[PDB]
Design a protein around this ligand. Sequence first.
Ligand code: 9ZP
Length: 281
Amino acid sequence: LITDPRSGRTYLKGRLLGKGGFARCYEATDTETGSAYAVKVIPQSRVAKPHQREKILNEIELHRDLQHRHIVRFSHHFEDADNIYIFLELCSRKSLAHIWKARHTLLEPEVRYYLRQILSGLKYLHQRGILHRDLKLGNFFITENMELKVGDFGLAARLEPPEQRKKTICGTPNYVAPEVLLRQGHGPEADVWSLGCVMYTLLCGSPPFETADLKETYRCIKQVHYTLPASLSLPARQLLAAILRASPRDRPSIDQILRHDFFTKGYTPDRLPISSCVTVP
Ligand SMILES: CC[C@@H]1[C@@H]2NN=CN2c2cnc(Nc3ccc(C(=O)NC4CC4)cc3OC)nc2N1C1CCCC1
């Protein structure tokens, strides 16, 4: 159907892109200009409580001015008594979670190709004093040009000193850093850890601390108990080992990650073919 603001400007809702607690996403085209967006439709009732209202407002607040080629462009939002409509950059090639579901694994140059873009995106965020806090495949949006845009600022936060930062446990369990599980909160090092998990998932097929239970995963994270498949290259295993460190201060910075042999000695394609979304390039 149609969506509209205070100006009466209409937008045609296309296909449902996805759901997940608690927003429905659609492709939305402006009726008068044809401008396409990825619209997050949030029911007002699901964000009526203060904590849920604050989460939604923070996402909008932090996402608003973010201008980087490796960051989803926030377009605009508006709201009525029923919904909150968040208009975001539509990325025609879905997400790395969609590609991962189709592929299971990516080849080393592909992982390197996406990791560079993710790191470029994250660096921009970190330089702006914003922590993503929810780095996962599901949050890396792919355009028609096979350009990765880091998205979903639903858990984004202002980077705060250790003593000041909220000590809340949040973020996708398979990607969450041990200091977060230890109620020390998220620092830039927690985003770096999530990237180590991203890298591992893309190379091996599954998150490194994935188990049957959440409790067991949390124990595996805290003890940094995971297996490095023998088939991954030495620079890939070296980088995964440097990144997946229990102590946040022992982890490399984004600049250090990018100066590691995995990136410096490895082949990075200038572009990946569209076909790589569903099958080996
Ligand atoms: C709009 C919400 C987020 C997002 N946040 N920031 C940018 N975002 C997105 C940008 N582009 C897209 N693209 C798409 C995602 C899934 C599909 C897809 O076909 N989904 C099939 C299961 C029905 C198609 C997309 O574009 C044609 N999704 C976004 N997503 C997806 C998250 C899950 C649903 C949409």
